[PDB]
Symmetry: C4
Subunit: 207 residues, 4 copies
């Protein structure tokens, strides 16, 4: 079990690692994780993941009450929706990472499972990835969709937006996010070449 | 309000962040920001954004008079044109960032709005992006075009060249630039795949 | 000859260099090298190549007995298969590097030589690259295939997975891996453009 | 005028900057620059540009006599050919940078001018880029071709290999190389889209 010290510390470090390696650019992205007391540690509003301050990270209750730190990111609203309908979720990584965001802008995505597996690792660690329709940023329908999907899915693709990825810790959610982004990137790299997709039996083996 | 200390400091740091992360390569790019006294702080001529010296950053008046530091970048000429016709502009980021430059070399661009929105963030923070025709570097027509566009547009695409992005601070202009470059990159990533563009009503919601 | 100090040190440094430069993401990848006593130094299970600890790197015998450090990566199983059938192999780099992994998901790969050479360097330093069929992670058939290929090939492409690259040291295996990944990347960059492949005589000159 | 101290220093720093930013991978690439005494400072054989040691950089005469430091890179042979037929050349950057190497593997390149300009900067700072046919590494025909081209061209594309870029200093040659690589990258980014190429009059303006 990690303390609030190390959790605040981990959040700053993970933010910097994501920013320096291109997963987050500019003002985009936010991180959250459950604290020991059941409250939420989150990156503050208008923040840059490469410039986080452990001391000023937001703390909010799952019901939306602001507890300490700078005012939370406005997207923490739909972070909470996930926590409130999945007790296994201890941390959420939300990014506009390039290829997962690209995938989110495509027409004709399978809304229940937008990544057709050709590598085993997303299946083992994440599972299927549903798609939330596009809505104006701040729309309550975003959080509503996530609350309904959270009991069955460990990650979510917000159409015309980007991924929302859960995990049993912040580092595990970050690893899940990096695995997802790498898989989305492989989609665009493979392009229209003939892909050796995983067979139906090969996908069932990985659960 | 930031002091000249911190402003010179911010410019060096932002330059290094842009250079290390690939937004600027070699000798390309320049930064400017309005000082408290109404003069312009700018990156010097023949400079490399990853090797800026706070102490030697150029200071020039909006009318072109060189005040302190190394001689300004020659492209500060069209930086000033923007400031002189947009009092909301406090900082300008000019880069040859790859995908915005690529977009600038295409034929058939909409000269009033070259980015057809499929994500909300460029619409919210920047708006439409006009295109300036290509002219020999140093041509006064570049600054002339920018002066005429500056009252209505917060960013500009110089054809066969690259973006010129304004902001209410250097960090905000850098975030706008990073958002624009990411959006241009998404264009080339999405390619000829069918894109779920934002509807006309979805674009009007974001102003 | 390097000591265990420097070998543990080299492994941590090489891991960090691969992680910071994008060759490894998240929890993916592992390194191994032969120690002076014939045992294997390897990166531990559930490890992140950018966060290795020299002091806790695993040590295992080539027959699978765990000797010191954290429990080895589960993929060290097929590392050992290579060592046990190639005495020239002193170090193995396994990554899910993007373009070699992409190449590994394609249909119709030549299973004996999946990289058709258009640059001399993979031929000089690595040679032909066979393809191992896809199998569920942990399948003994993976190690079996590698043991049979190891006497004739210095690198291997695990289908729907990624590269396994040998070398006379960890740095040489890393350089071989970087050369291979760059060559795989060139394949996807060149795309369907007409390539000046190396002639048959030009390939024979490089051995 | 820079001293040997600063020149050795600049070479190490420039190497690290090129390696960390992806222009050089593994064992590929070499740098050279003319010393005040007319001898050549060069990166040593089997070296990694991110791990250079100022103290052990090679010094060789333009006629090939090894003077100090580790044994020079074998590719310094064709570095010297350029110096011996262009007194304006004070530094040479040779890389296998991805997109310039990709361009070098294409069929049907214009051997006198392989980059059709759609941005002004390669024309202003480099000029036309000839193509040297592919030859086995170490072939004297490589140096022969470069010696014949050096009086008229400031950079050269070795087919199936990579760029060789001159400059009036190491930093200027590095900036030329970065500008060239960015232009080659734009070629592959633009792909088969209709490009607004620079007109014939627009290219003549830039000399
Ligand atoms: Cl926010
Ligand atoms: Cl300039
Ligand atoms: Cl493992
Ligand atoms: Cl060499
Ligand atoms: Zn978002
Ligand atoms: Zn410019
Ligand atoms: Zn693996
Ligand atoms: Zn070379």
């Amino acid at each position: 079990g990690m303390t609030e010290q190390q959790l605040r510390e981990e959040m700053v470090q993970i933010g910097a690692s994501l920013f320096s390696r291109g997963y987050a650019t500019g003002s985009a992205g936010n991180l959250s994780l459950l604290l020991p007391d059941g409250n939420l540690l989150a990156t503050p509003t208008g923040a840059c993941l490469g410039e986080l301050q452990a001391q000023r990270l937001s703390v909010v209750t799952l019901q939306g009450e602001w507890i300490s730190g700078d005012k939370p990111s406005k997207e923490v609203t739909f972070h909470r929706a996930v926590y409130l309908h999945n007790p296994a979720c201890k941390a959420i990584v939300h990014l506009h990472s390039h290829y997962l965001t690209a995938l989110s802008c495509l027409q004709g995505l399978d809304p229940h499972n937008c990544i057709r597996p050709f590598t085993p690792y997303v299946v083992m660690r994440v599972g299927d990835v549903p798609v939330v329709p596009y809505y104006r940023p701040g729309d309550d329908r975003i959080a509503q969709a996530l609350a309904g999907l959270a009991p069955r899915y460990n990650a979510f693709l917000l159409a015309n937006h980007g991924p929302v990825v859960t995990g049993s810790s912040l580092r595990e959610a970050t690893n899940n996010t990096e695995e997802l982004e790498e898989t989305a990137r492989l989609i665009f790299t493979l392009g229209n070449r003939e892909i050796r997709y995983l067979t139906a039996d090969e996908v069932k083996e990985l659960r």
